Design brief:
Chain lengths: 306, 309
Amino acid sequence: ECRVLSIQSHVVRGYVGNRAATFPLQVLGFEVDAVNSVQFSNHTGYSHWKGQVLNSDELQELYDGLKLNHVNQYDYVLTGYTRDKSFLAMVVDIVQELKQQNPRLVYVCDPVMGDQRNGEGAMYVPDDLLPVYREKVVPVADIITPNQFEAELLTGRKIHSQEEALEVMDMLHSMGPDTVVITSSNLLSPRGSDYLMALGSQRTRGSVVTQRIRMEMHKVDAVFVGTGDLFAAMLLAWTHKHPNNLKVACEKTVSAMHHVLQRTIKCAKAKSGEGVKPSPAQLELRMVQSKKDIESPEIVVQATVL
Amino acid sequence: ECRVLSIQSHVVRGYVGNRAATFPLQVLGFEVDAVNSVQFSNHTGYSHWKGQVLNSDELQELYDGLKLNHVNQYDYVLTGYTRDKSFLAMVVDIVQELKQQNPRLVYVCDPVMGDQRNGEGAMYVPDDLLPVYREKVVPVADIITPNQFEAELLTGRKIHSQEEALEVMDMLHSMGPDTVVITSSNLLSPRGSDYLMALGSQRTRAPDGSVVTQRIRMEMHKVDAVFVGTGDLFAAMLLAWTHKHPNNLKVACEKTVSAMHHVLQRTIKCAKAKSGEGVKPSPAQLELRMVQSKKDIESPEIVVQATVL
Ligand SMILES: Nc1ncnc2c1ncn2[C@@H]1O[C@H](COP(=O)(O)OP(=O)(O)O)[C@@H](O)[C@H]1O
Ligand SMILES: Nc1ncnc2c1ncn2[C@@H]1O[C@H](COP(=O)(O)OP(=O)(O)O)[C@@H](O)[C@H]1O
Ligand SMILES: [Zn+2]
Ligand SMILES: [Zn+2]
């Protein structure tokens, strides 16, 4: 049995943060302990939203409860969007302390930054977070899933080509994480302008045998929320099964992603009218109805080894 | 697609309240919208626990958000443990308003107040809740799952036999709910002193004004341990199975109780293996093995047969 401590947002309706990460990990066999950093009615993609936030002190209280009961033994820690540097700093303390009892604990981090839609009632992420991610978070993270924009901020470098991306990924490796996956980029894929390009790199430490891969997925014509959280949660599961094969781990992860999105866009267009654009409420991920696809995804993409 | 609005507690670790109700409903195909009434590190069966509570105002804020976005359309509402009458009163307002847009909404309610451990009842909730459950909650509830102790408080009547239980269940039907399930009782089962007896009753008013009532009895072998979150798990699965078998309380209960059995057996086996020999399992070791019971919850092998009364 593998136990995951996931600390992310919670929404009453829809799927983002912990809502997008718990069901997938559960059906995949993981014991998930969920700390909801916030509780909103829905995500910020809607016109309205109401809810309450948890401060670093409250986060500490919860962790203390687990500690007092001697049940603070985890195999994985998983975090994502956060817009409070004080909260984020608290997370690092918790991870460090946990890695103390279990040097084998794996910390999966998705360093969210920018004007992204989230489930924490926020319209943006304060710039004062970059230095916390850069100097405290990344150094203790084992698997990180930044997008191109985030990868650039973390390394202070810009990416103009596939070769530069690989260089930035190497810079991230030296900062700490043995596995780095750039989930989406602006790089033009050789397959076509309609494909989204993702890059992956894993340092398997004994010299460092580095496995690098590239993946191209056809873009779906719509804006989704929570996809990044779903990605990170599934990558966690699949890397656990294929600890030394980033290629397979990413192929199953991205395949699932495809099935869920296809089912989601089909149902969204069916519920809205003819020629009517689906609304964010209609675009909520069809998580429950994708159970079989998440459990065992039919591979639909092939990762090319670089 | 059936959408459920579940308003119950949340624990970081373990399974109780919303943690025990969401996963089962999700694997069974239900779209679950969860409002966490509280967030604790774990349940109170542990020696320590820390967390925060939500007040009636915060509950209202959340509901308002759904309402402002016009996404307050539900098919089911599911509630359980509550320790604040103000919060409970707020729940009733929400249910009434929802039943306005959807006359077909089904409200499943587990009126938690206490249990009868050996012979004497003990209240977990302030006594000032009983009146609220009695006059405000039960009247708008469609399915209720009280234990013997709770059934007695709601009707002000004592249960000394199977016949008296059936009378109390009829009294509850008059108060509102067409479906009543007494999940556990002190009644001695004809099968043996080691079996737990549950009773079920579902009312159907025929077109001509006649009333057909299906009544059933169920006996389950006791597992030698104290579990937490089992009542929440029960109510969540009964919701799912009654949805599939709308007019057959017999089958709905057989599938529901069969799943309970599978989950508890797997849970006690793992607990004893983790404890050590001769060592009693701790509450932390007794947390329901929810995730590892996925298959059993999806399609339970029937292991109990309901007796029609
Ligand atoms: N419109 C889309 N079409 C196809 N895939 C998408 C789309 N949007 C997101 N994804 C998938 O979601 C993941 C991207 O998450 P995203 O919201 O873009 O995260 P990030 O902003 O962290 O790069 C990728 O694996 C990608 O394939
Ligand atoms: N020790 C046990 N042995 C067998 N079944 C149990 C045991 N404890 C709980 N259950 C199951 O859980 C449900 C009862 O929940 P329980 O803790 O007894 O709730 P309540 O006190 O509200 O009646 C029943 O369907 C019952 O079969
Ligand atoms: Zn992201
Ligand atoms: Zn109960």
